[PDB]
Write a protein that binds this ligand. Structure first.
Ligand SMILES: [Mg+2]
Ligand SMILES: [Zn+2]
Lengths: 98, 1885
RNA sequence: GUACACUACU
RNA sequence: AGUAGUGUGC
RNA sequence: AGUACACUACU
RNA sequence: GCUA
RNA sequence: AGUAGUGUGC
């Protein structure tokens, strides 16, 4: 996408499109993500709270994964995705990161 | 396929219990595949996907004013229609595999539309588009419809349908009713292959033995089963069913006893441990001491490397004459009196030129100028030695042995006792001695001390300077490691040894018996005297400080001379083919070191180089005895269950003559112990499932295992590499015929002498050796024959038509080959002639027997060896064979041929024990061809048999098995342990978790002991006699053949018995004289042993039956335990891979492992097999089928063997063809998961070896960089000896055209206008008219003039449309012409007929005119014996075939291509004839004359448009590869966590010709289609011949050679006809199996190109590669493509990404404003997104984007109505408590009645056809239905029914009254299925 | 179609 | 030598 | 009676 | 083995 | 000397 900026309070969603560490659909890979990867998005020009600026994000529950052991003689784990709890949104992952 | 609908079909399959409803599932699956292809094709055409529109709707859409009162169009419905340019196109989609349905529906539509065609005054084109689902190929019928659509972009996958078809079939496999349902037609047989049987069979003594071996009722069953005629009887299976129901009692009791053995087993299986390995080692060392002569003295060692080395002296000149003077003055100056020192001083005096260097160089340069002036050799001028000071110089570095300067005693002592001219157990060194191993360890430490130091040289060479950029940007660490190799003394040592051995071979070619020669290298200290195959040499090293020499046990003595020391090695005598491997050793060294080192920082490079300097330079058996048993020792020590003690105690025989053998033996011994200790350090990677495919599988990459050959930690893939790679270090053909022929004869005769005495009975019951359980065999064959021939009904048709039984024998490529075959006759005169000529040659050679074998031997069976095609020519000329159908002739030779003879010879393989190979006579080939193809096409049906799988796809079959077993294990452990793991959610939960169901995965990697020798051949009689697709007379003849085949004789070879009658001592227990009765006959009757590989498919089928019995035993044994099991068993000829997955609860896993291995041994023994327990190992993770691994679902292969064959042999034709074959060595490595940097190392080594062969290394005399406008060899084309510069994905895909292709892509990237740069290749080739040529670089002008005048033609034009492709172009330019004689060829019959035809009076022109008037048999085979005989006669006019018939070795070809490098060998007139309108010419003046001529030619824009039109725009593969390289976008780097196997899709998606190419050329040689229509194929071929003007160019060439010659030439005309029909043959060409190992699975074509570019860029990670625009074209192989693709794909990706980004990441309350702000204001992939939205709105698939078309205001009712037809669902109403309304798409029912009785029912449809009524009744009565219709009514016409199904199940669907009665009759067949009526209820209006 | 090379099972 | 392939050259 | 030729190098 |  | 070998070969 080659598109002019899209400022929304304190985020550039164009930079969210161009991001590579924050477009995962797992809740854990965004919750455990880095501040360097989030510092790409910030473009404020005068807000006063992160909670007021993060309103322009998703409130739907993400599809995270839960790995269980298999109980076999070559023992291993089998991971898979799964809808999380009402709290496992995208805004909550960004707030925990912050 | 819309995953929800996928899941509804899948849950519709899992719930199936009836055999009557799976037919409905199959029909729904086929129509779902059909309309999926319809939607995708109407998408790629941008036409509206209509369904079920009749003709009347088409008429009122085209002509909307007529009423149907005028006309009645027929009520047949197309798939779709299209009206454009006042033409109606009736379109019909097919997903068939053959055109048989297409032609009949074409006839139907065309016939029923010719009436309406000329009434409405519009033409009606009938278009049929058929796609093949296994290999996506479009076949559009209308050649006018393709003019509308020049480019068609379907890229879809039909494997989500193949999966459901195969799992539904294997669910309902053993049922017979459903197999009758999925029958194509009926069980039909053809005409008989023979009209009468063989009554001599019943009186045959082998049949008498076979019959009296069996008890009486089995005798009667066999007697009546041979005579069963399946065509006469009512059902074909009424014999198989009879014998199955006979033997079912004994079968079931055996399976139940073997299943009850699960409780008798204790958990003590054959584990490895250090105790058993130590005891096996003790028994081994005792056995080896009793076999060998164990030595303790260190000076009995053999040379580990046949070379000593010293470093270079910079203080001396590296001039050749100065080094010659230094060598002579340093040999003369030896201080001391050793044994041979006077001979060394005398040889130093014989080469003393004093100081007359100028006279020496003048004389030698004059001789070399005389030699290089001719193409031939200089004849009839003798060479005189010139007296130079103190040297009789004969040539450069060739000195006479002067009898005045050496004493006769010293000369005799030197040539007798040092050179070995004229001069009882094998003596090996004690590998278990402490002092011997300690001396070995000090040898290795001393070599590491000298060779690890730096050189003091630059590391610049050919490999580094020319490929280091590629190697470096693939991986910086590979570049650093290769640099560190090139800095040390290892690389200088092995480079000096390669250069010195190349000089030794170049020097010893023209050495004489009285001359010695001197060979030099780039090191000014290391020399070599070549003494007078068997090259004898001695290395001489001048070194300053004593003890500063590399000595791998080869030194004779270090001596004191002036100005330092001098060391001379012992005299080494080697073969030419061993010195050949020595020359190529830097490639082996560098490959081995970089492959061992790769991606492992725990290893030290000096350790790897120290090991690999000895493994890369070992050309003796002493390491062959260690590298192949190392696999079995280390893997059996690593495994769960093995008999490594038995392998060491019985089979490991180390043969340690060298000290490196002793060192490596201690490495193997330590690694066995260490391999046992570390098997608990193998972990599994966490598996990501998706319910669709497995990503991230395999084995974890932790370095915890101890390395084997050198200290360090290592991971499991690298550990298996260290185990399995050293076997490919071994050379091939290190065996001597004199010893391996006696070894093969001994092992055959020992097995036969064992079986003549000890093996008496044939059948058993208690698993005795070489005996078969009869009842189990018979019942298992009955079951598997029933299953296999009940799958497919036309199986005899498939056998006859896939193997050409009805055709002539001259059309089968195994009967017309050039391999050896045996023949028996009175061949006395020819053998006496060749014997007296070879003795005459011997005595003439020594001036400057067969008859003693014949007279001593009375019962000598006389023979001679012949090629196969010559034997066929002889049998056709002597009228033994005819051009009748071949299978009748085979059935006649099955009676007419009684005595079978077989001789043998050695394989000459790299195994320590060589393998026997049997050559049989031609009639045996015919009969075993018949038997084996009958067995083959049934092994094609069985999924467990793996020879029938075509090559290397077995690596993908392994992955499919492993993935289904992981999925089974996951689902089974989640199902069985469901309630326990729910009750989990602390002392109370652990003991709860101890009682749950635990899993077990077991993998048996089995081999079989003596698969062909110790095999009961009598079970194959029961395989033949039970076969229902044969006639009784055919069975009778085949069994009579096998009865005669068991009475076969084994002729011992004549050279073997030459070397046994010249033996002069009676051998102790001569088994050869025992079996041959003291050598009075050369033949031995072999009975049981059926040679080798003669019966691969038959034995594989019976082995698959054995594994079926084993599978059934394990199923019953586990269902005794109330647990689940999945057994897979892949069966090759004898390699077996059984994988057992068990989830049970009752007993421990050790008891199950012990039971399973006991029962595997027993199940192999019940069928006459025997599991090789010494080589059979059991693991958890590692599968190992035929050299193919599967680690935990991730496929794995040793790519090191394909890397190590990059210095292999070749044809040695020219500098291009050698490079071509060596690059093919690296492409196969890339297929087997090689990293990119090691692939570039292999490509570099390939170029290095090729330039070494022709003296083209940088600086040498054939180096082309000083002759062309180029700054490096990357800027010289490959044809003119440049190096290959292309991306690695491009090299792997197209291959060797990637040089030209990548050069043209670079020119496009450099010179196109800026606005056309991020576009397709077709849109950029159209901008060549805007190029200016005055600013092209001189390199670019040169390389285009190469492509314009030496690759293409001068008469070509930029406005042509159908020029040739790269495939129709020979690529060589500079090939050396060798002056050779043909050969002997006296032994051939057809060659004698050829020589009788040359001396015939004007007879050869009849042959030429018969070839020319019937020209198609210059490129293909002939249909009858006349065509074949004239082709066989004509093939002797080609020289290259005649030199192919005479045997040659690649070493002599190599030496000749070295030495003939400065000769004039390039016929430059053949190159000059290429363009505009002397003798031979060297390489350098060919370069000069070529660059002289190309400066005179001109190059304009029209010529570049010719170049781009003929290299790129022809071929669709070149278009899509250029588009992948231009338009690629790289993505996110990630590791290769789960690799997978994927086949290469074909890039030429569209086909024009639908007959076979031989048939098309045979029909083009006439003007008559001879078969279905062929009106299109001949006119496509005629358009191709006329539009590129092949015929006129051929006429111009024959006319100009007529004008040059004057007399009417025919041989040139046949060369022109041959080239013409070659070009036509590659034009028609109507595939391959190229499976790769890629980081994900590639389903489409563009996904395969994405994974090929994403894999081959870095070693460490892989990238996600998406493309800018459509990277495909519209087929039409030799046809231009001037039309690009509409960018609808970009619009699809854009709005799919936008909608899913917007509802995944953006807040929900503001998503429409986000969408508007995207659409109005952004751009996706350089295209404005408003334009992509306009593309979607103007398209015909707006129904895909319904949520996008809403929230923006562009959506209307036609879209929703269109959409509704697609995804149709079911709607119920009315659960009040009496009328139901079940509505669907154009399908609604209304049902009126009480609880008891229903009054009437009204269906409502769109069309009233009896198919659609039952379909609608099935779908509308499958949802929520109040009740179960529980009453009946008498019934007369459609009704609603129900059948009962066990435990409260019913099926609800509408039948006809007639169909109610018919299905009640069919389920009232007398059977086992308990009968359920379809008791019918209420009437359906 | 012929020739050559390679891998794999015998 | 039979097999199963793959790739090169005419 | 003859039987004909490569490397020649940063070392 | 090939050439005079 | 070298190569091969519990079959003498080269
Ligand atoms: Mg195996
Ligand atoms: Zn701010």
């Amino acid at each position: 996408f080659e598109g002019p900026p899209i400022k929304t309070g304190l985020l550039d969603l164009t930079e969210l499109m161009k991001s590579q560490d924050l477009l995962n659909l797992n809740y854990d890979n965004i919750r455990n993500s880095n501040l360097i990867s989030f510092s790409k998005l910030i473009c404020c020009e005068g807000s006063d709270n992160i909670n007021d600026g993060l309103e322009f994000l998703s409130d739907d529950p993400m599809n995270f994964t839960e790995g269980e052991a298999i109980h076999s003689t070559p023992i291993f784990n089998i991971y898979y995705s799964k809808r999380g709890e009402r709290h496992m949104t995208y805004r909550n992952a960004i707030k925990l990161l912050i | 396929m819309d995953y929800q609908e996928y899941q509804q079909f899948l849950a519709r399959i899992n719930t199936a219990r009836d055999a009557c409803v799976a037919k409905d599932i199959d029909v729904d699956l086929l129509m779902a595949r059909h309309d999926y292809f319809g939607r995708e094709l109407c998408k790629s055409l941008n036409i509206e996907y209509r369904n079920d529109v009749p003709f009347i709707d088409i008429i009122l859409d085209i002509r909307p004013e007529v009423d149907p009162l005028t006309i009645d169009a027929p009520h047949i419905t197309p798939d779709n229609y299209l009206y454009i340019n006042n033409v109606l196109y009736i379109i019909d989609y097919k997903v068939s595999v053959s055109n048989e349905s297409s032609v009949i529906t074409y006839d139907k539509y065309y016939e029923l539309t010719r009436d309406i065609s000329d009434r409405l005054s519009i033409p009606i084109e009938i278009v049929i588009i058929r796609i093949d689902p296994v290999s996506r190929d479009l076949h559009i019928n209308s050649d006018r419809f393709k003019e509308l659509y020049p480019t068609i972009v379907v890229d879809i996958n039909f494997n989500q349908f193949f999966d459901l078809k195969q799992l539904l079939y294997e669910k309902f496999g053993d049922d017979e009713e459903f197999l009758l349902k999925v029958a194509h037609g009926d069980f039909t047989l053809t005409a008989p292959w023979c009209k009468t049987g063989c009554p001599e069979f019943w009186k045959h003594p082998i049949y008498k033995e076979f019959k009296m071996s069996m008890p009486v009722p089995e005798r009667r069953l066999f007697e009546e089963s041979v005579k069963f005629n399946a065509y006469e009887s009512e059902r074909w299976n009424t014999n198989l069913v009879k014998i199955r129901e006979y033997t079912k009692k004994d079968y079931s009791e055996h399976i139940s006893k073997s299943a009850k053995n699960i409780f008798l087993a204790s958990g003590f299986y054959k584990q490895p441990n250090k105790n058993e390995i130590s005891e096996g080692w003790t028994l081994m060392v005792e056995r080896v001491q009793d076999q060998r002569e164990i030595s303790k003295s260190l000076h009995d060692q053999k040379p580990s490397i046949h070379f000593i080395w010293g470093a270079h002296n910079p203080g001396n000149s590296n001039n050749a004459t100065f080094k010659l003077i230094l060598l002579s003055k340093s040999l003369q100056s030896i201080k001391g009196i050793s044994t041979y020192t006077e001979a060394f001083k005398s040889l130093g005096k014989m080469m003393d030129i004093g100081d007359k260097a100028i006279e020496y160089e003048e004389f030698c340069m004059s001789l070399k100028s005389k030699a290089r002036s001719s193409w031939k050799q200089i004849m009839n001028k003798k060479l005189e030695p010139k007296q130079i000071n103190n040297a009789l110089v004969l040539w450069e570095q060739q000195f006479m042995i002067n009898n005045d300067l050496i004493d006769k005693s010293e000369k005799l002592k030197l040539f007798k006792n040092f050179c070995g001219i004229g001069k009882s157990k094998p003596k090996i060194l004690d590998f278990d001695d402490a002092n011997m191993y300690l001396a070995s360890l000090t040898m290795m430490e001393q070599s590491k001390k000298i060779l690890s130091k730096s050189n003091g040289l630059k590391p610049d060479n050919f490999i580094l300077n020319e490929f280091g950029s590629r190697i470096k940007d693939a991986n910086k660490e590979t570049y650093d490691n290769m640099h560190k190799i090139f800095e040390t003394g290892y690389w200088q040592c092995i480079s000096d040894f390669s250069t010195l051995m190349k000089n030794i071979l170049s020097v010893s070619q023209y050495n004489r018996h009285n001359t010695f020669r001197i060979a030099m290298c780039a090191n000014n200290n290391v020399f070599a005297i070549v003494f007078p195959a068997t090259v004898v040499y001695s290395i001489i090293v001048l070194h300053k400080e004593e003890e500063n020499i590399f000595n791998p046990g080869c030194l004779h003595g270090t001596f004191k001379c002036m100005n330092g020391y001098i060391s001379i090695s012992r005299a080494i005598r080697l073969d030419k083919e061993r010195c050949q491997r020595i020359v190529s050793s830097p490639g082996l060294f560098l490959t081995t070191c970089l492959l061992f080192k790769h991606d492992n920082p725990t290893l030290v490079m000096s350790d790897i180089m120290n090991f690999s300097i000895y493994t890369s330079l070992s050309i003796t058996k002493s390491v062959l005895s260690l590298t192949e048993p190392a696999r079995y020792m280390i893997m059996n020590s690593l495994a769960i269950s093995s008999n490594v003690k038995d392998y060491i105690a019985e089979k490991f025989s180390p043969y340690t003559k060298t000290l490196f053998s002793v060192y490596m033996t201690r490495l193997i011994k330590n690694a066995c112990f260490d391999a046992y200790d570390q098997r608990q350090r193998v972990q599994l990677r966490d598996i990501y499932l998706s319910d669709y495919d497995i990503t991230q599988k395999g084995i974890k990459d932790n370095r915890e295992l101890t390395s084997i050959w050198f200290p360090g930690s290592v991971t499991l893939k690298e550990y298996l590499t260290q185990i399995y790679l050293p076997f490919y270090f071994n050379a091939k053909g290190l065996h001597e015929k004199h010893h391996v022929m006696v070894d093969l004869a001994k092992t055959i005769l020992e097995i036969e002498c064992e079986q003549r005495e000890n093996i008496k009975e044939i059948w058993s019951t208690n698993c005795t050796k070489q005996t078969v359980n009869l009842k189990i065999l018979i019942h298992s064959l009955c079951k598997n024959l029933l299953a296999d021939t009940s799958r497919h009904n036309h199986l005899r048709n498939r056998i006859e038509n896939r193997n050409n039984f009805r055709r002539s024998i001259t059309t089968i490529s195994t009967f017309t080959s050039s391999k050896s075959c045996l023949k028996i006759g009175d061949f006395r005169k020819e053998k006496e002639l060749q014997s007296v000529k070879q003795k005459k040659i011997l005595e003439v050679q020594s001036r400057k027997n067969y008859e003693m074998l014949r007279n001593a031997m009375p019962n000598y069976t006389d023979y001679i060896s012949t090629k196969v095609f010559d034997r066929l020519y002889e049998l056709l000329d002597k009228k033994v064979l005819t051009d009748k159908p071949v299978i009748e002739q085979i059935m006649d030779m099955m009676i007419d041929h009684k005595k079978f003879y077989f001789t043998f010879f050695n394989k000459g393989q790299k195994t320590s024990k060589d393998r026997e190979i049997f050559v049989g006579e031609y009639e045996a080939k015919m009969c075993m061809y018949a038997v084996e193809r009958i067995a083959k096409e049934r092994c094609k049906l069985n999924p467990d048999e793996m020879i029938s799988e075509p090559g290397d796809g077995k690596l993908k079959v392994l992955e499919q098995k492993s993935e289904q077993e992981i999925r089974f294990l996951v689902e089974t452990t989640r199902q069985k342990n469901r309630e326990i793991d729910e009750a989990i959610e602390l002392g109370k939960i652990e003991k709860l978790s101890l009682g749950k169901a635990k899993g077990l995965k077991m993998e048996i990697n089995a081999d079989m002991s003596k698969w062909s020798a110790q095999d009961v051949f009598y079970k194959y009689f029961w395989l033949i006699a039970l076969d229902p697709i044969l006639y009784p007379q055919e069975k009778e003849r085949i069994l009579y053949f096998m009865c005669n085949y068991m009475d076969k004789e084994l002729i011992l070879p004549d050279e073997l018995l030459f070397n046994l009658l010249d033996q002069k001592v009676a051998y102790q227990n001569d088994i050869i004289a025992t079996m041959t009765n003291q050598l009075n006959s050369n033949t031995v009757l072999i009975k049981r042993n059926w040679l080798q590989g003669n019966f691969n498919y038959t034995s594989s089928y019976v082995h698959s039956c054995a594994m079926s019995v084993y599978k059934e035993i394990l199923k019953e044994a586990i269902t005794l335990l109330d647990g689940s099991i999945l057994v897979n068993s892949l069966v090759h000829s004898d390699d077996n891979q059984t994988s057992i997955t068990i989830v049970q609860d009752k007993m421990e896993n050790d008891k199950i492992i012990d039971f399973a291995m006991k029962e595997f041994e027993r199940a192999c023994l019940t069928f006459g097999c025997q599991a090789n327990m010494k080589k059979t190992y059991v693991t958890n993770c590692i599968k190992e089928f035929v050299s193919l691994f599967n680690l935990y679902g991730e496929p794995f292969s040793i790519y090191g063997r394909f890397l190590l064959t990059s210095v292999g042999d070749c044809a040695y034709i020219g500098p291009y063809e050698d490079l071509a074959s060596r690059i093919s060595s690296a492409q196969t490595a890339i297929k087997h998961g090689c990293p990119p940097s090691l692939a570039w190392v292999s490509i570099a080594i390939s170029h290095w070896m090729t330039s070494l062969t022709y003296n083209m290394l940088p600086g040498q005399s054939n180096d082309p960089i000083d002759y062309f406008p180029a700054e490096n060899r990357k800027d010289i084309p490959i044809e003119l000896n440049g190096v290959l510069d292309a991306p690695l994905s491009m090299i792997s895909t197209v291959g060797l055209e990637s040089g030209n292709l990548y050069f043209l892509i670079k020119l496009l990237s450099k010179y196109t206008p800026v606005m056309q740069k991020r576009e397709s290749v077709v849109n950029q080739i159209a901008e060549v008219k805007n190029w200016k040529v005055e600013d092209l670089t001189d390199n670019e002008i040169f390389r285009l003039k190469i492509l314009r005048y030496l690759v293409l033609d001068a008469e070509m034009d930029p406005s042509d449309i159908m020029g040739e492709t790269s495939d129709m172009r020979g690529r060589s330019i500079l090939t050396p012409r060798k002056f050779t004689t043909a050969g002997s060829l006296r032994k051939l019959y057809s060659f004698s007929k050829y020589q009788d035809r040359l001396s015939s009076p004007g007879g050869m022109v009849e042959l030429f005119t018969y070839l020319l008037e019937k020209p198609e048999l210059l490129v293909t085979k002939g249909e009858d014996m006349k065509d074949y005989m004239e082709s066989v006669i004509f093939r002797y006019n080609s020289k290259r075939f005649k030199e192919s018939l005479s045997i040659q070795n690649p070493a002599q070809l190599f030496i000749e291509q070295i030495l003939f490098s400065h000769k004039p060998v390039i016929d430059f007139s053949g190159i000059r004839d290429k363009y505009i309108n002397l003798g031979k010419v060297t390489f350098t003046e060919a370069y000069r004359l070529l660059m002289r001529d190309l400066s005179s030619l001109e190059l304009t824009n029209d010529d570049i448009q010719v170049i781009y039109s003929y290299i790129i725009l022809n071929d669709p593969m070149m278009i899509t590869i250029a588009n992948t390289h231009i338009l690629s976008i790289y993505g996110s780097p990630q590791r290769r966590m789960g690799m997978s196997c994927s086949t290469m899709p074909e890039f030429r998606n569209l086909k024009l010709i639908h007959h076979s190419p031989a048939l098309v050329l045979r029909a083009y040689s006439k003007n008559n289609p001879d078969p279905t229509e062929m009106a299109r194929d001949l006119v496509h071929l005629k358009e191709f011949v006329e539009n590129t003007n092949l015929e006129e160019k051929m006429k111009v060439r024959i006319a100009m050679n007529e004008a040059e010659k004057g007399q009417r030439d025919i041989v040139f005309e046949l060369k022109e006809m041959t080239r013409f029909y070659q070009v036509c043959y590659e034009y028609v060409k109507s595939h391959k199996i190229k499976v790769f190992i890629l980081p994900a699975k590639s389903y489409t074509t563009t996904d395969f190109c994405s994974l090929m570019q994403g894999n081959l860029i870095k070693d460490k990670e892989w990238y996600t590669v998406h493309y800018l625009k459509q990277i495909l074209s519209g087929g039409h192989k030799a046809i231009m493509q001037h039309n690009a693709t509409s960018e609808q794909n970009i619009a699809f990706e854009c709005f799919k990404l936008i909608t899913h980004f917007a509802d995944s990441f953006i807040d929900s309350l503001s998503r429409s404003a986000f969408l508007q702000l995207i659409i109005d204001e952004f751009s996706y992939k350089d295209v404005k997104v408003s334009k992509l939205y306009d593309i979607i709105k103007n398209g015909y698939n707006r129904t895909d984007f319904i949520p996008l078309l809403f929230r923006t205001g562009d959506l209307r009712q036609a879209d929703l109505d269109k959409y509704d037809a697609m995804k149709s669902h079911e709607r119920v109403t009315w659960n009040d408590w009496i009328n139901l309304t079940i509505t669907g798409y154009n399908r609604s029912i209304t049902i009126i009645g009480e609880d008891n009785k229903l009054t009437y029912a009204e269906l409502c449809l769109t069309r009233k056809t009896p198919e659609n009524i039952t379909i609608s009744g099935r779908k509308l009565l499958g949802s929520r239905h109040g009740l179960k219709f529980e009453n009946m009514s008498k019934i007369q016409n459609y009704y609603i029914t129900y059948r009962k199904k066990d435990r409260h199940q019913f099926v609800y669907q509408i039948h006809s009254h007639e169909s109610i009665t018919r299905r009640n009759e069919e389920h009232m067949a007398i059977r086992t299925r308990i009968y359920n009526e379809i008791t019918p209820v209420c009437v359906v209006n």
